Structure 1
Amino acid sequence: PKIFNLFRVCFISLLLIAAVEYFKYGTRINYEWFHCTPIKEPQSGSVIKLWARGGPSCDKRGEYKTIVKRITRDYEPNDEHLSFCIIENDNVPPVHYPIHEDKGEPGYVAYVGYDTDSELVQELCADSTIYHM
């Protein structure tokens, strides 16, 4: 009669159940990490241009999430204050990437920078509202 072995195997099984449960949940709440890859193409200065390029799983929500993540994670507003803008592509449905190789014009495109070169960001974001951070 051995009980501690029973709890050893039951605890391992239960922990594995909870591990897979959290794997599914984690890959579902933040999925754009797996599907979308940020493509940053710097302009003149601290200003860069962002978008996302993935498969059909990189819908407009994934593009928006990955752009926002890049904006709020690659720029430190405690050093100096940044300012960005996000531009939507209206001639595009929410799911708009072919699987293979020529994804096309991205759903969301963002311009980010700092305030030492804020004028430039105002120039690129022609009419889109500028956000500050």
Structure 2
Amino acid sequence: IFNLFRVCFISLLLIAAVEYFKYGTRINYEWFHCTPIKEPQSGSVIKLWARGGPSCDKRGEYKTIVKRITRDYEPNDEHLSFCIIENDNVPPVHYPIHEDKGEPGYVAYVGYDTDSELVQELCADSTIYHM
């Protein structure tokens, strides 16, 4: 009885354990597939895009870009400005398996507002988003 309950409980935990792995990986897939790459421009400003294989699709880059924008900068310390520039010249799935990748499908320039003017120069015509 109790032994069965333990067998059932541990088995159901394994079921739930595997389910969350499938769910979490499917939901945070960009973490496993998209490597954020930084190019510090000046001050707090950086150029930001994600790199990876076929699974690092445009959505994954955007999620990867947003993650570091929203984690490497604390608006409650200082307000920040950023822009995410889509690469119109690649499809959502563009990155090949091998390391000779092309232009990223998404790029972002993000910096603290003390550097606001710089972000605008690097963002050019792209909309400036504030956090």
User: Which TM class, normalised by the smaller chain length?
Assistant: over 0.9
In 1: Cα distance, 2:92 partner to 2:3 partner = 52
In 1: Cα distance, 2:50 partner to 2:7 partner = 44
Deviates more, 1:6-15 or 1:64-73: 6-15
> SS at the partner of 2:85?
strand
Query: C-alpha displacement at 1:108, in angstroms?
Result: 0.3
Structure 1 unaligned segments of length 5 or more: list them.
Answer: none
Structure with more of its chain in helix, by fraction: 2
Residue 94 of structure 1 is matched in structure 2 by 92
In 2: Cα distance, 1:30 partner to 1:13 partner = 25
In 2: Cα distance, 1:50 partner to 1:102 partner = 18
Asked which structure has the greater CA Rg, the reply is: 1
Query: C-alpha displacement at 1:8, in angstroms?
Result: 1.1
1:6-32 Cα deviation digits (max 9, x unpaired): 111111111111111111011101100
Match of 1:107 among 105, 108, 112: 105
1:32-87 Cα deviation digits (max 9, x unpaired): 00000000010121100000000000000000000000000000101111000010
Structure 2 unaligned segments of length 5 or more: list them.
Answer: none
The number of aligned residues is 131
Structure with more of its chain in strand, by fraction: 2
In 1: Cα distance, 2:31 partner to 2:102 partner = 20
* TM-score, normalised with respect to structure 2: 0.98
> SS at the partner of 1:7?
helix
In 1: Cα distance, 2:35 partner to 2:119 partner = 23
> SS at the partner of 2:39?
strand
In 2: Cα distance, 1:128 partner to 1:100 partner = 30
- Displacement over 6 Å in runs of 4+: none
* TM-score, normalised with respect to structure 1: 0.96
- Give me the CA root mean square deviation: 0.7
